[PDB]
Amino acid sequence: ENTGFETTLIKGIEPIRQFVLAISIYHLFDTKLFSLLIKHEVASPEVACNELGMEKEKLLGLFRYLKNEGILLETIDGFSLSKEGHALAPFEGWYVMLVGGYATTFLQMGERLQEGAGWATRDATKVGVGSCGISHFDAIPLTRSLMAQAPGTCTKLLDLGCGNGRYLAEFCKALPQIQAWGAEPDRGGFEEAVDLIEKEGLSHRVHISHSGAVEFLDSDFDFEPDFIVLGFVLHEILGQAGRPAVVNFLKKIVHRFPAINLIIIEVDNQFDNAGAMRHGLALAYYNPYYLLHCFTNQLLVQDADWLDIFAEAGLSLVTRETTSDQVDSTGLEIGYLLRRA
Amino acid sequence: ENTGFETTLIKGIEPIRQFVLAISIYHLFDTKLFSLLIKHEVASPEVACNELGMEKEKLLGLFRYLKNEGILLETIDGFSLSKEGHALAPFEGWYVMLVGGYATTFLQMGERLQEGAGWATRDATKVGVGSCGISHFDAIPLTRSLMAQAPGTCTKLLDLGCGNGRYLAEFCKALPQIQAWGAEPDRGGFEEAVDLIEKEGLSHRVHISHSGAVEFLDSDFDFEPDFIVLGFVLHEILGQAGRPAVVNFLKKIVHRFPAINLIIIEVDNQFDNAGAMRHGLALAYYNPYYLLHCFTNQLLVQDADWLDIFAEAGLSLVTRETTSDQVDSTGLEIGYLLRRA
Amino acid sequence: ENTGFETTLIKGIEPIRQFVLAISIYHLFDTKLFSLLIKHEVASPEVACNELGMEKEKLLGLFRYLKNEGILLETIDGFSLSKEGHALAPFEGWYVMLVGGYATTFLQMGERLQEGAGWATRDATKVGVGSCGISHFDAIPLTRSLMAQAPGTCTKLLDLGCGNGRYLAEFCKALPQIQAWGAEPDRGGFEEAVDLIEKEGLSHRVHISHSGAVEFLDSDFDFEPDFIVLGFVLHEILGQAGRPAVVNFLKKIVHRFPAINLIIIEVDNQFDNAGAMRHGLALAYYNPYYLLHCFTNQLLVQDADWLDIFAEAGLSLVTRETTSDQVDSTGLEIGYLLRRA
Amino acid sequence: ENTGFETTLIKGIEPIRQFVLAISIYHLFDTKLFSLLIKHEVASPEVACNELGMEKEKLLGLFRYLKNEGILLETIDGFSLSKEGHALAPFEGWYVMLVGGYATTFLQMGERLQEGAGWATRDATKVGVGSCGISHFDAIPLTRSLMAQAPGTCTKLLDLGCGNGRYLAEFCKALPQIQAWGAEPDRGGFEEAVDLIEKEGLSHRVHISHSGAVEFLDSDFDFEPDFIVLGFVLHEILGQAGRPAVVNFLKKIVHRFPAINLIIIEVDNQFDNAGAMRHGLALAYYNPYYLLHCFTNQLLVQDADWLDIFAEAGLSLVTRETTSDQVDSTGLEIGYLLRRA
Numbered sequence A, B, C, D: 001e002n003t004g005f006e007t008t009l010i011k012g013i014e015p016i017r018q019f020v021l022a023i024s025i026y027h028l029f030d031t032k033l034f035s036l037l038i039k040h041e042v043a044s045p046e047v048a049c050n051e052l053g054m055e056k057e058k059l060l061g062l063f064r065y066l067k068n069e070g071i072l073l074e075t076i077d078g079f080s081l082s083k084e085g086h087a088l089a090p091f092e093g094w095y096v097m098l099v100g101g102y103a104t105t106f107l108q109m110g111e112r113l114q115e116g117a118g119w120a121t122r123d124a125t126k127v128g129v130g131s132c133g134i135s136h137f138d139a140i141p142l143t144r145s146l147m148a149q150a151p152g153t154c155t156k157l158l159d160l161g162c163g164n165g166r167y168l169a170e171f172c173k174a175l176p177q178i179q180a181w182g183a184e185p186d187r188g189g190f191e192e193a194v195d196l197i198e199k200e201g202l203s204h205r206v207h208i209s210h211s212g213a214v215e216f217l218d219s220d221f222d223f224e225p226d227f228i229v230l231g232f233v234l235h236e237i238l239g240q241a242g243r244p245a246v247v248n249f250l251k252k253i254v255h256r257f258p259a260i261n262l263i264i265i266e267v268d269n270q271f272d273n274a275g276a277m278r279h280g281l282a283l284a285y286y287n288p289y290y291l292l293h294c295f296t297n298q299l300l301v302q303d304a305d306w307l308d309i310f311a312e313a314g315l316s317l318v319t320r321e322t323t324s325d326q327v328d329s330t331g332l333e334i335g336y337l338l339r340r341a
């Protein structure tokens, strides 16, 4: 009979309905259709196709799908972002990072669970670009707050694992005296960083290198940074190379630059903390973030584990802060301002 | 200031939270962890790992993620499906089809929108296995209803595009006189069909061929089916080969078997019908289904377009029915019972 | 142990969380706080209190509650409507009708289920005001569409069960030549109608009477309307007085005004129609609407039952239409344009 | 044109859809229909009507409404609780308290905001019965944990503001040696307490008095309790009588019983704490709870304010605990075990 089955089916596949919506919103941003709709206000599929070099029948299908979900409006003149569509604008970075960067990673979990199957891969170009977009809201203001509390003023800034260079673009625009250097090991992210710096008119003040963090510190250069930012990069080194390697890397930084101010941003691993995981942002963001870190070659640890690593590396904590409670009130994103002990 | 940003962020990325949940539920089913939890009732990560050949730290991460979402319970003895987890059991086919089969397809939409980029690919093995799982609820009962209304009793059944052979397994178990033949062009789906038929003890009554529908009808065989089922296959032929090819294929069927009863199941294309698209199942299932058909080499048309194709092919409609309103009340899934005019 | 109980509790009481939010949004509109926030942009509790004659500690509690739900933003200068709060503006009529008018009705259902307990009461003033607010979107445009299909021109309009007189105000602003008369039996609704007509500068063109529909038609007056509108009033007469009374009332209308055009708006009773009840607006609005109509002295019947009543009353159907699919695509709200047979 | 209005309307009035569902679930429990469906498994409206003395057409309306929402299933034999309906069972206390006890309170907020309008009323019988139902999960296990940490053994227990006496029934069933006395000032709650104690076969061990807490301590009796429980009652006395009255009341307790162990359960007022208010249970339960406490004659204060009151009353804190993180992980429900300083 299957009595009452349909009502249970509609609820049972609600995650699938939102799964397709999340990928469709990601493409709406990533293909620049979102930016096109903002600029044109109303655009026919023909006009959007001519501008972005797309095929009309496929574009009309995406637009009809989004209109059925209320993201777009359709009039005789074409399609436009609805109020709900416009409201998505600030969240671009989260879609780019988690869908663009990590969709393949989540899809690989079944095969990667097998004994000896290795780490799930990701699209590190989208992870870096998306992460930088998110950092505009949480990590960049946290880094700015920590920088203002250091005894010295920043004049030469080094950002290792810089993604598309958004921290350097924001700090340099706000603080005109700064000269900066970013290192990004992902080739795609490195190319986006060189492009962003050029587009912002900062190429005379900011250089980007295609390099990993450890290899950059082992390389030869005359730049003498007074600040180094490690935004969510130490846990990647921790997973990739191990704890002794992280301690040695931090020791190398203060051996080479004894007067440097280090700003480290990390996520506290509270995956197994029942109360922390009930916060709406811990469930929407941190729960999938913790899951992907169990399948990739990256290792999140607790606030106390980081403090112990800093002590072992011969670093003193100047101050520790979490993000503004207006953007992320979980207390899981922590910034540390450190100096040589 | 970003005043009130976090509350908007939690709602803004709700599709991403459910996107990861949908992929995680898909793996819970696909890896056989769901079946293991049903059998064991409670299982430690060590016990599940030993049984399925998995790695404990990755499995513990998936289990902790699912426990945070309420799908699993954790006690000192291990993990178990919660009431919410158990409730997911009937929906396996939808997760396997839409996530397993079509996740890559949705992820390809951005690149496939470009002029000349071609059709998005899919994992046709998962599409066929998942589709057969869904058909247990909607299309198999619809096919059974249409078969009972035909003038002749079924003795030799041909199922073209059979997936894992679930229609043949269900009809043969319920109707012991039937001999059946299935054709599935996807190698993976064909192998699952041979395995399912063997596991059900039906290899003496059901044969499966690795073949497409048109090529199967052009092949040489002595089998004289009195019923042919085309469950969601004509729209694939329509997209792949065009309307004249579909008409010629239908004409070939009644030329070769003039007394045959044809049962065709298709989805009515009402993507642009405002009222139809507000039904909860049209939004959860048919909206993403219509979207994927704009990006793959398959073409959905309306009920009237199908009736016109049948008239052109020299077929008469015996009866037309939609699915039981207890499982799918949209009126979009339509079954046609046809014979030679 | 209550293992995993909290996650089930948060979902289990989700209807209670939204129950309080719905009442709070209703008060935000009804107390004029919503209009105050629109005008001031930002207001401290002190400023809102002084303007509306409210108590600061209670107002701060409502504001903090709404801020936690994201309806309001709080800055050093005070509270403001968020983008989410602004987006609620068009829905005022639904909150005023279903919460203001019918909260007491839903709350009485437990006691009214008892044998001989009678009909649940409602706040008919809020039902009329709220219903008129809703009608701006659905029923007024439907009435306008039906009026344009009638032969001749409207010069004298009679609206029986007019609520706050919104149809008369809207029709008088679009058709500056018409004179109008409204009858509303609820004293509160009648007083709101006299006030709305005066505020719109229409008192020289529109008269309102405190009267029921049947009693108005039995009264003495020289007004010769060429159009009579019965917007969701016949089913109230049907419940209150019975089917013979409705037929007699309709007969009386065309006996007194043989050349009149009648426009009747009614809701088709499809409470027991599985497919109809899966539409998102059927669940959000029509399911509670049907429930209220089982506990109040009002009777909804099917489209065919209305057509039979019109035939028995000696009326002929000129045309029948449903609402625009841009506002209500259920097909449940039906407008009939009738004349004497 | 109202382009795309319907999709915005369905989301805009989602709180109203859940508002009606919450009231309907409350009645399903309160009228004993939920218990009837559990016992019968399947019941026709006629059978439920005959058993509970209800009217068939109204009951059929409630049942059809619930079936459309998936709470009930309908077969030829009648209606039954679906899996979703069965899953509601543990949450009865929350529906009885917040809907039964406080629906009138939320509905009065608009009028009670006016200067000099006084405190909103509530149905204290439903608040006490509902609160006791909730306490089975959170506060009773917390009280049991605190009792086990006190020196000696409980033999005489006094519960002031006992509601329906559920703590006394549960403590008497787990500790068969204890005698108990409860005081409840609400007449309805007092009568439910006398009935519950009798139904549990505990009338020879447990006495209930119709009295407030302060008046009970001022009355004459020979009972010498070694434990007194004040479960969510001190904040009611605080609002009703003021801080000096609460301090005097606590002083009176240890003056009369110098060796007594006091167990006080209170909710920490973190209404204005951004991070606390993002927890799913803080939004679902504590946000409406805080709102009700701004409109009723009850005052919630912070953990530090309670500790200060205890110090001023001459009490010393033995231990302080929050609820099990399996049921309530907000840290907002706090239990204090106190003794004379």
Ligand SMILES: C[S@@+](CC[C@H](N)C(=O)[O-])C[C@H]1O[C@@H](n2cnc3c(N)ncnc32)[C@H](O)[C@@H]1O
Binding pocket: A124, A127, A128, A131, A132, A133, A135, A139, A160, A161, A162, A163, A183, A184, A185, A186, A189, A211, A212, A213, A214, A230, A231, A232, A233, A236, A237, A240
């Ligand atoms: C999570 S993203 C953070 C980007 C940026 N720092 C921010 O805070 O938004 C981590 C970045 O570090 C890069 N990365 C990974 N391993 C690294 C390594 N060993 N050295 C330097 N960067 C690394 C990744 O490619 C990626 O761009």
Ligand SMILES: C[S@@+](CC[C@H](N)C(=O)[O-])C[C@H]1O[C@@H](n2cnc3c(N)ncnc32)[C@H](O)[C@@H]1O
Binding pocket: B124, B127, B128, B131, B132, B133, B135, B139, B160, B161, B162, B163, B183, B184, B185, B186, B189, B211, B212, B213, B214, B230, B231, B232, B233, B236, B237, B240
């Ligand atoms: C949507 S699934 C439906 C499976 C099954 N008939 C059912 O109703 O559940 C479509 C199936 O047809 C197969 N198919 C695709 N093109 C085909 C063709 N030209 N001939 C035969 N089968 C085809 C696919 O590989 C897939 O297994």
Ligand SMILES: C[S@@+](CC[C@H](N)C(=O)[O-])C[C@H]1O[C@@H](n2cnc3c(N)ncnc32)[C@H](O)[C@@H]1O
Binding pocket: C124, C127, C128, C131, C132, C133, C135, C139, C160, C161, C162, C163, C183, C184, C185, C186, C189, C211, C212, C213, C214, C230, C231, C232, C233, C236, C237, C240
């Ligand atoms: C659902 S409201 C509809 C108001 C308005 N016609 C509209 O379409 O928005 C029904 C109105 O009819 C009024 N009413 C109820 N019984 C009536 C009667 N016997 N005669 C006239 N009006 C009646 C109610 O007081 C209420 O104002």
Ligand SMILES: C[S@@+](CC[C@H](N)C(=O)[O-])C[C@H]1O[C@@H](n2cnc3c(N)ncnc32)[C@H](O)[C@@H]1O
Binding pocket: D124, D127, D128, D131, D132, D133, D135, D139, D160, D161, D162, D163, D183, D184, D185, D186, D189, D211, D212, D213, D214, D230, D231, D232, D233, D236, D237, D240
């Ligand atoms: C929130 S209920 C808590 C009931 C029970 N103690 C529990 O923990 O579930 C508060 C109860 O205290 C009662 N109450 C209110 N004012 C009181 C007073 N001054 N003295 C005693 N009880 C009071 C109310 O009637 C109600 O039954």
Ligand SMILES: [Mg+2]
Binding pocket: A232, A235, A236, A298
């Ligand atoms: Mg990382």
Ligand SMILES: [Mg+2]
Binding pocket: B232, B235, B236, B298
């Ligand atoms: Mg297909």
Ligand SMILES: [Mg+2]
Binding pocket: C232, C235, C236, C298
């Ligand atoms: Mg009505």
Ligand SMILES: [Mg+2]
Binding pocket: D232, D235, D236, D298
């Ligand atoms: Mg209280």
Ligand code: NA
Binding pocket: A131, A134, A135, A139, A232
């Ligand atoms: Na981040």
Ligand code: NA
Binding pocket: A239, A293, A294, A295, A296, A297, A298, A299
């Ligand atoms: Na890892």
Ligand code: NA
Binding pocket: B131, B134, B135, B139, B232
């Ligand atoms: Na299907």
Ligand code: NA
Binding pocket: B239, B293, B294, B295, B296, B297, B298, B299
């Ligand atoms: Na296609």
Ligand code: NA
Binding pocket: C131, C134, C135, C139, C232
């Ligand atoms: Na209406």
Ligand code: NA
Binding pocket: C239, C293, C294, C295, C296, C297, C298, C299
């Ligand atoms: Na009625």
Ligand code: NA
Binding pocket: D131, D134, D135, D139, D232
């Ligand atoms: Na409580």
Ligand code: NA
Binding pocket: D239, D293, D294, D295, D296, D297, D298, D299
């Ligand atoms: Na209060």
